[PDB]
Design a protein around this motif. Sequence first.
Motif, PDB file in Angstrom:
ATOM      1  N   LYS A  24       0.779  -1.217   0.000  1.00 24.48           N
ATOM      2  CA  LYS A  24       0.000   0.000   0.000  1.00 24.48           C
ATOM      3  C   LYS A  24       0.814   1.271   0.000  1.00 24.48           C
ATOM      4  O   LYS A  24       1.998   1.276   0.326  1.00 24.48           O
ATOM      5  CB  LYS A  24      -0.955  -0.008   1.189  1.00 24.48           C
ATOM      6  N   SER A  25       0.168   2.361  -0.374  1.00 26.42           N
ATOM      7  CA  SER A  25       0.848   3.632  -0.417  1.00 26.42           C
ATOM      8  C   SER A  25      -0.080   4.769  -0.030  1.00 26.42           C
ATOM      9  O   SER A  25      -1.296   4.679  -0.201  1.00 26.42           O
ATOM     10  CB  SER A  25       1.387   3.857  -1.836  1.00 26.42           C
ATOM     11  N   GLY A  26       0.502   5.839   0.497  1.00 26.52           N
ATOM     12  CA  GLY A  26      -0.282   7.012   0.830  1.00 26.52           C
ATOM     13  C   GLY A  26      -0.114   8.016  -0.311  1.00 26.52           C
ATOM     14  O   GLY A  26       0.030   7.632  -1.473  1.00 26.52           O
ATOM     15  N   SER A  27      -0.126   9.303   0.021  1.00 25.01           N
ATOM     16  CA  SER A  27       0.043  10.378  -0.964  1.00 25.01           C
ATOM     17  C   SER A  27       1.554  10.557  -1.245  1.00 25.01           C
ATOM     18  O   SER A  27       2.304  11.037  -0.391  1.00 25.01           O
ATOM     19  CB  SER A  27      -0.588  11.672  -0.404  1.00 25.01           C
ATOM     20  N   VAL A  28       1.986  10.149  -2.439  1.00 25.22           N
ATOM     21  CA  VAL A  28       3.394  10.233  -2.864  1.00 25.22           C
ATOM     22  C   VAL A  28       3.606  11.387  -3.862  1.00 25.22           C
ATOM     23  O   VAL A  28       2.777  11.597  -4.753  1.00 25.22           O
ATOM     24  CB  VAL A  28       3.852   8.913  -3.576  1.00 25.22           C
ATOM     25  N   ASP A  29       4.713  12.119  -3.721  1.00 21.92           N
ATOM     26  CA  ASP A  29       5.024  13.236  -4.632  1.00 21.92           C
ATOM     27  C   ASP A  29       3.964  14.358  -4.617  1.00 21.92           C
ATOM     28  O   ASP A  29       3.782  15.073  -5.612  1.00 21.92           O
ATOM     29  CB  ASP A  29       5.199  12.719  -6.079  1.00 21.92           C
ATOM     30  N   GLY A  30       3.271  14.505  -3.488  1.00 22.47           N
ATOM     31  CA  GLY A  30       2.244  15.531  -3.372  1.00 22.47           C
ATOM     32  C   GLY A  30       0.980  15.271  -4.187  1.00 22.47           C
ATOM     33  O   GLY A  30       0.333  16.214  -4.651  1.00 22.47           O
ATOM     34  N   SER A  31       0.620  14.001  -4.353  1.00 21.81           N
ATOM     35  CA  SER A  31      -0.570  13.635  -5.114  1.00 21.81           C
ATOM     36  C   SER A  31      -1.225  12.404  -4.510  1.00 21.81           C
ATOM     37  O   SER A  31      -0.630  11.327  -4.477  1.00 21.81           O
ATOM     38  CB  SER A  31      -0.198  13.358  -6.582  1.00 21.81           C
ATOM     39  N   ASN A  32      -2.453  12.549  -4.027  1.00 25.43           N
ATOM     40  CA  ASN A  32      -3.099  11.395  -3.447  1.00 25.43           C
ATOM     41  C   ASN A  32      -3.714  10.480  -4.496  1.00 25.43           C
ATOM     42  O   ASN A  32      -4.412   9.526  -4.162  1.00 25.43           O
ATOM     43  CB  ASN A  32      -4.128  11.813  -2.384  1.00 25.43           C
ATOM     44  N   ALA A  33      -3.453  10.748  -5.772  1.00 26.39           N
ATOM     45  CA  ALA A  33      -3.986   9.876  -6.812  1.00 26.39           C
ATOM     46  C   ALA A  33      -3.035   8.685  -6.847  1.00 26.39           C
ATOM     47  O   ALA A  33      -3.330   7.623  -7.412  1.00 26.39           O
ATOM     48  CB  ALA A  33      -4.024  10.589  -8.179  1.00 26.39           C
ATOM     49  N   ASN A  34      -1.890   8.906  -6.202  1.00 23.36           N
ATOM     50  CA  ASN A  34      -0.825   7.924  -6.059  1.00 23.36           C
ATOM     51  C   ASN A  34      -1.096   6.896  -4.969  1.00 23.36           C
ATOM     52  O   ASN A  34      -0.444   5.854  -4.945  1.00 23.36           O
ATOM     53  CB  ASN A  34       0.495   8.629  -5.763  1.00 23.36           C
TER      54      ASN A  34
END
Lengths: 103, 103
Positions: free
Chosen positions: A43-53
């Motif tokens: 799993k992942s959270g908001s990466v690179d300032g984008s929660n589409a990630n």
Amino acid sequence: DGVGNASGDWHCDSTWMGDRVVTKSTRTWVLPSYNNHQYREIKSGSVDGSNANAYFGYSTPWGYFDFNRFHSHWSPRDWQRLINNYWGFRPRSLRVKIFNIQV
Amino acid sequence: PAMGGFGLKHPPPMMLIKNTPVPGNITSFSDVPVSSFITQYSTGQVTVEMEWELKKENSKRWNPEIQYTNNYNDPQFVDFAPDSTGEYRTTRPIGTRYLTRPL
């Protein structure tokens, strides 16, 4: 069958027969044991300032065969023979074979 | 033949044609051959139909080949087409060797 007998042969080719063309490809693959045999929930959270990630999913210990690229079936030269002479094309059938396994 | 092409023992026979002469007004007899004719010309259509046999290219070259291609940088007119005057243009000799073969 047995240890000292090969389970298949190498086929790479292109056979043009008028309205049809048949391509054959053989490759050698290697398969690692992934994850050490277990499923994991990735799993992942908001990466690179984008929660589409963000995502939630699963990795498995399986690998898969993927032949969904044209260069997996066509040589540069057969591709040229196709695009310089035909107006179109479409896939008709598929046959796959896995053989000569070695653990 | 030095100029290229096929050398034939018995080539396509010559086809000759002429306007049959038609005498002008002749009023008296003479043993001397007639020398005044009605002037005339002919016209018609001619159709030639040739069958050619081809030798299929059977290469295993991997990379793409050289091909004769319509390549012009900034065309002012279409080559192998009539121009604004109606006269047919041809700017280049087109040979016959583009495909390759190992010796």
